[PDB]
Structure formats: C-alpha cells, structure tokens
Amino acid sequence: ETPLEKALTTMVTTFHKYSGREGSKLTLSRKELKELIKKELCKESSIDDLMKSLDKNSDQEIDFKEYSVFLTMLCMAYNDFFL
Amino acid sequence: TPLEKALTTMVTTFHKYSGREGSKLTLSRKELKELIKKELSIDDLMKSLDKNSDQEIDFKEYSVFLTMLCMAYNDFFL
Ligand SMILES: [Ca+2]
Ligand SMILES: [Ca+2]
Ligand SMILES: [Ca+2]
Ligand SMILES: [Ca+2]
C-alpha cells in the first residue's frame, strides 16, 4: 500500500529470494550474500569482512535477524548521505 | 535495485516527518503519530523506542522500529 509498507515488503522478500538458493532457506550463506548485494545493491571478498561484521554466532551464515542488522547499517549510511 | 529504493524510503520517510517541529533530526510524539498513521498506543510505542527518555525519537531509535516491523513482516511471510 504505502511506500513504507512496500519498502518493508522488499526487505523481507529480497532476503528470501536469495536465502533459499542453498543450505537452509532461512540463512544466507556466503555465496547467497554475495549474490544478494551485487545484484540488489551497487565485490571482491571484502564480503569476508562483511560476513565477519554480521555473522554474530560465527556459524558462517547470515540469518534474518543478522540481515536485519545489515539493513540498519545501510539506513544509517543512507541517512548520513541524506544529511 | 528495489532494495536500494526500499532503504531510500526508510530514510526519507523519517525526515518527511522529523523536520515538522523541534529538531529536524528527531521525531516528537506528534510527528511519530503522523508517521505511521499516514504511512501504515503511541504512548506504549514511545516507551518501547525512546531509549534515552528524552521524549523524541532519533534516527537510530527509529531504526529499531523499522527492525520490529521487518521481524513482523517476516513472520507474516513465515
Ligand atoms: Ca541459504
Ligand atoms: Ca550466523
Ligand atoms: Ca522533529
Ligand atoms: Ca530519544
């Protein structure tokens, strides 16, 4: 309906358009995360550094809460460009 | 990239409402109540989000709101 609701909707579906390609469909592996960004945001394994930043449980996959934190970092940054 | 357009909606919506009164960088109770009603009680949500008890929602605090919503949307998606 409203652009905000449509925004939220994109965040949740985008997660699942990539998490279900391999392994648990609930978690983005390294590969799924790399496909995610490259195709949906703006690429060498500095994915590694990100993985590290986001992967709280050191299980080497990004679950949905963990992705939620990525989305936040992005918003904070989009917010500063905005000013 | 829709994702990007989504993140864009996140920040501009905040600012579409934060600069109406008081600091242009925070949402008062009134601005918050505007956001939400036009874009999707408050007292109990204020209490939830207002980490510093200053009675304004700064951008980080709004961030925690957006997360709450995604967690939810993620459920209705299952
Ligand atoms: Ca997966
Ligand atoms: Ca993890
Ligand atoms: Ca304000
Ligand atoms: Ca506050």
Swiss-Prot record, chain B:
InterPro entries: EF-hand-dom_pair (IPR011992), EF_Hand_1_Ca_BS (IPR018247), EF_hand_dom (IPR002048), S-100_dom (IPR034325), S100/CaBP7/8-like_CS (IPR001751), S100_Ca-bd_sub (IPR013787)
Calcium among keywords: yes
Residues that bind Ca(2+) 2: 50, 52, 54, 56, 61
Annotated EF-hand domain residues: 10-40, 41-72
Pfam families the record matches: S_100 (PF01023)
KW Repeat (keyword) present: yes
Residues that coordinate or bind Ca(2+) 1: 26, 31
SMART domains: EFh, S_100
Domain of life: Eukaryota
CC terms in the record's Gene Ontology section: neuronal cell body; nucleus
Self-association and partners: Homodimer.
Function text: Binds calcium, zinc and copper. One subunit can simultaneously bind 2 calcium ions or 2 copper ions plus 1 zinc ion. Calcium and copper ions compete for the same binding sites.
Protein's recorded name: Protein S100-A5
Annotated source species: Homo sapiens (Human)
Lineage: Eukaryota, Metazoa, Chordata, Craniata, Vertebrata
